[model samples]
Target chain A: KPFTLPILTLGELTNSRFPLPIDVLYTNPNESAIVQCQNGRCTLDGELQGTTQLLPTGICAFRGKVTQQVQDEHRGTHWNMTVTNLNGTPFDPTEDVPAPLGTPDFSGQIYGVISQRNTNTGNLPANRAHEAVIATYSPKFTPKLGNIQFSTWETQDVSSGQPTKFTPVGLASVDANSHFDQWTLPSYSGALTLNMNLAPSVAPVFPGECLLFFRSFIPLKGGYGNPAIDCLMPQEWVQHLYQESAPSLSDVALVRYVNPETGRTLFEAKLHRNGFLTVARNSAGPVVAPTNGYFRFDSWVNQFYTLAPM
Target chain B: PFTLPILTLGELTNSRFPLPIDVLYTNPNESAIVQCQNGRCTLDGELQGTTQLLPTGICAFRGKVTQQVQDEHRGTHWNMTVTNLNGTPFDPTEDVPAPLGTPDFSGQIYGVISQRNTNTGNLPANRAHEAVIATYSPKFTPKLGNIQFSTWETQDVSSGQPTKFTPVGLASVDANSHFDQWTLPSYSGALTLNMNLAPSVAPVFPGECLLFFRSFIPLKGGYGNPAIDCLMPQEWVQHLYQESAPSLSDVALVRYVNPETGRTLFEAKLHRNGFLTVARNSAGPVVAPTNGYFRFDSWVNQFYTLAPM
Candidate 1:
């Protein structure tokens, strides 16, 4: 495909608010864009082919790219947005999309919700604090990105009277062991990413937001309570993935079952899909499935096992 | 007890069985417009259905109320965060709400008293199942002034350990079709209305006594919709709900009968209550199936012998 990749070079930024390093890449219907922001703190430099070199600001530039690809249907457009809290393990959500068939295809974004006991003051107040990867697109910029919706798969921007725009996933759960240091995240979801990759793929555009939204709720009178967040993954995070050998398997499951007879919840682990568990029989050794009954998915867990009425 | 005659809760009936005593309960300025029986239909102005008491008495006609917490406090991290009363009315130095505001935050607000008396037939673990209410803070409106109604909240616990709770009905991820037993164990709380609410317009706080509380918890299933308790419009469920109403709605007030062999679990105050009591003869939660949250009601209407303080 490539002979000598255009000598990669990044540009300087006049603003320094977002000092965190970012890689801005520009590609075409086939791999023929003139700018390469390959891991740049500023501008991108690559050989341009058919499109002009002049760039549109904010989200519009990327918005145009992805929208056109989406309309074609047969065409592909994949993206990544990696947001981490304890910031270490990086799992990109955009890699495995059932796209081409489902474009405008903004799916698989990692939503990590971290719910924990923070205020250690006075009788330990009741409430678990939560946070996640939040995404906002275009418009806020000079000649902002157009045709880009600004809503999430869940709930919407009601005040602004906005349409369905974006997607968000949550990393919300309390540690079963009741440990403060660990949040039961993996039990709910995995594949959390908030950045882009240099790997070859289809084409598309995306917008961005530089702020977090402060949210709230009444609880018993609930349905809406929220938190603000950041959604950006680091450079080495993606690079390591590019260089490593792939994994052997990547499939996890979920389940819900309680004995209909006793309602005793026999080994009711409620095992989440991505968690590593040892599915077992009461007296026997490990097995593919538990004896009596099971979950729709091959879901199982042996870690925290005890269900009594509190 | 001459000029103005008023009845007190403790004086309702007898301290023994066949103790079916009824009160001529009324709203202040006494009006016969309503009856203490909640499940009864109004058409006949006669006898109808029955069950647990509501959170408030006749006076707080607006029903059990709560101060509307602000949107600012509900941000995700704070959604489940603490809340203290703010503003005009009471003391402003408030404490944040515990179990921090969830639909599940109101039914049975309890604290760790004592448990695990494996001395007799009850297992130490099953004692963990036993809960008691020593003090209570009705679900008042969230307001200003340091309004810390009560401090006794200890709901979720040490991995199936003891926890405090107030059960309210909630719609499940699957509303109509799904009925959770978890919601069932929390039903009796709704009956607090007769014992709670009221005290408005005048000086008499309807809930004057420090008596304990309970009602039809572990709600009657089949229909009343498993999402939340107290929901009426009974269809396939009113049948079961009616059957459960009569027996399931009585609140209990007991000092956790800790065994002498041990000081009890969690908090060991190293003491005991040696006053009034009942016997376990012919004891059984007779009407219901297998042991459940309503297990204690077994000795309900049945005659019982008593013990002295």
Candidate 2:
């Protein structure tokens, strides 16, 4: 007899921070349904219309066997999954207007590379723009889809309470309409991956409105080619580089010599706080400075040199 | 207060120039200690054994240190006239046109610069190694003394010979509106500036030369001996390269200014990266190309300082 594997335990991740302060539930009895609960309570903004149970384990676990499949369309491959017996009740998610998940019972928010059936559950009340893809039922295992890699932090802002805005790490960029969202533990390296093999399949509703960001992702040699989430965009990376390139105030002042009309540098000189000065020419080498003396010019070579001590 | 520390063979080697033969070893019966006092040095041992020296390897020598007095300064220094195995003087200026293969000088002490282990088979003839026949401690500062010359003259354009002129102190001539020759005041014999040493293009075209009387002074102090000062820059480059030595750090930055107008003209920045950048303030900063190499024109009176970054 095939057995069920309890891969993920929501009780262990209740302290995890999300984009908002709420717990989410996805189940399908006769139709796919989604429920959003406020932490430990399933009152305001909770989807209680379907066969969903608020498990004592701080999550809403829905019992059902979920079957996953891929559909090829004119544009790209279409992702579709169906729920058989959600919450131990026989149900058809395609025949219903709204519902929410599962190969196993799910609790709280499930972040994986899976998908919800076609149609919004309509079970959510309002102000619930935080709906994301329902990838896996167990929330225990993440399927490896494509070889995606990147590097460097996208920003330095991490001051939000608990669920702060994500920062991209390593040199990752966005070139297409795809999401690379990640779920991370608070201030920890333990994290989970979502959105896999969905690129070129999911058309972004809006460019800037996409709900995907990475925090401290491992930098790749040849960076990812898919669309970069909000965090690792070029605008954000440019800001980061600017902050690092600012020099200290006490650094020696290096003045430039250029052709004013062409703006081409002819040479550069370092003016130290002390009276000493050093000149570096374009063709002629540097005219090294003497400790307490000045430089004498050689008009023939268009260069300057120091005289010996008296 | 005339004294000096016991000069070790290593210290002597550190400050001495390469000898003609391979080794300068103490006699087996003598101590290897070298002692200096009152600006004079004596070897505790005799110079014996065959050792390798640059440009002339695996040769034998015999020598003893002696004292020499400088009448002008009223000072004395030590001298060592090394000779061939037969007690004849070794002429370092003599060109040897072939290689001198390594010869055994084991069980003998010699200067480090003559080490056979690293310098074997490197004895190329016809090359002149630096010669240092004397070494001394600068215990007290020496004053500059002048040499006396009877009269002065200029090179007569038509005669091409010295034409006695009445100029007492200074003389300058812009020859044919091209070459400029300046002669500073000096109490000396008829002086001539080596035109070959002058820049082809200078304050004027073809050549510009300055003739002046100058004296040498030790700019730094140590064991007070400047035996190694005779080594050429190329020799030092080879020595450092062979020893994998570190290069000098960048000197301080300097601004060249017009002395009369007191206006800043140009600046030179000695970067810690072994590069020197010279620039003026009239435009954007210029950068050196990736292929830029450091160059310092060595001339009389040109000075530089080395310091930590």
Candidate 3:
């Protein structure tokens, strides 16, 4: 959210300070955009009066997938993307290329295609989310995030099936529900069959309140633009911690965007345990703060882009 | 950094672990409903029925079968619980001991969006996904009412210019008004509040709703790389699907070699089920003599501090 700061441009700077403010967006290292879009868009509060090169973009950033046409439409060039459902058009995601030691993931990202980049997940395992970003830009415009893309097809299944002839959707979804839901998360790689699959079906009963709040039971495409992602429903349900595990060094298994090729980390923040993830220009090693930065992870699209000021 | 070092993926993917997928059953991020036997198991991990808990679950990966994702997804959402790898689910209103699952309203905003995996021809050939850019006018509280735009999905799944998309990977357009029920109240705003994944309708529209995995298909050409797209997983090229590749050595050496040349282009250091970031470039990242791949030779047990930012 905002009421201040007309941040710098790719030309304006080099350093970042400790614990600055960022419109943090996230999702599980491996989750879905169905609910993320449902949950994500409303979390931040504010109007983008001006624009900045630096945007706090990450996994599930946009909250959906893309199609091949979009990927092919703008091949290897900068372009814009739309839901097709929105503007009803096509664009492109850039081709991945050689990047500096810091920005290797771009090596593989189809630029114009927003989701083509490593939206989340890390290059290395140890330093997952520790890779804070400080995106650079040509002297032309602000160092805003690049264009993003979306997709959800030729999906696969993890349990039992042929890795070869994969696109597993016998049919899934809720009865007569419209718009969208996680029901459509992909499974196989080809065509997905649609079925009226409602989630949180952990078996209803007085003792099943937990299952209703948490719908990981029946799997099916959430119909329409929905792909096949494992959804935790309410369409907007947030997971709560029951208890911490045995004294372990890790608390969560986070993610980061990499060159996808060179596999370099982008953001270099002194991530706080308190969900305050940022690249501190100063000294802000991982801290133990309160829930001020209560993090909420999500799957997103595109690279380091920012909404410019109107 | 005191405390029992929470390790990286490089550590867990090692062959030395016997079956790390089993070791991680208790991983805080994993639900207790999951169980791994003989290294194969399923739970709420991905939409798959049997999610493999590789090397004791240091990573969040996917699984399963059906015409699509899960016969049903039984996992919890991040609506709340925050499992600190330090091993604590940051305290929220709900808990796993389990768990489930943000905000805003109004004005135009710009930046990156989202993406899903297109069909890999891993099957015959498939292309279905969405594309969108909108201009919404949201309420200070964001709604499903403020969206306005058109539609699109995969470009070639059909043989047209792409007005509507093939059904599986959906897409649509509201053009001017009657956006059906499709609307993105958080349009042109900070939050994405619309469900169409679309700015047109409630729930989500068809285009942005592509697929979530349980019953669909794995489109990485076979590298199980939907986990990483835009960039095909190295193994996909080397012909190694998730199930076929040799397990990582404890040292976790993912080597990128020129399949053309026997020369090792780069050797990555990692844990068991870990991914590679670069550093060792044998030829300035020159086009590989071969389609070089990262080869794991050993495994590590400790929390390896990787190259710093």
**Top of the candidates by DockQ:** 3
Off by over 4 Å in 1: A1-115, A119-310, B1-293, B296-309
Off by over 4 Å in 3: A1-310, B1-250, B280-286, B300-309
What DockQ does each candidate score versus the true complex, computed on alpha carbons?
0.01, 0.00, 0.02
Q: What is the Cα-based TM-score of model 1?
A: 0.18
List chain B TM-scores, each candidate. 0.19, 0.17, 0.27
For residues B131-200, what per-residue lDDT tens digits would candidate 2 score against the true structure? 1111011211011111111111111011111111100011111121111112111111123211111111
- When sorted by lDDT, best at the front, the candidate numbers are 3, 2, 1
A106-219: candidate 3 lDDT, tens digit per residue: 101111112122223323111100001111111111111222322223232111111111111112223343222332222111123221111111121121111101111112
What overall lDDT goes with each candidate model?
A: 0.19, 0.19, 0.20
DockQ, Cα level, model 3: 0.02
Residues A29-141, candidate 2: write the lDDT tens digits. Answer: 12122212121211111222121222111121222222322333323222222222322234443432122221112221232111111112224211100111222222222
| Docking quality band of candidate 3, CAPRI definitions | incorrect
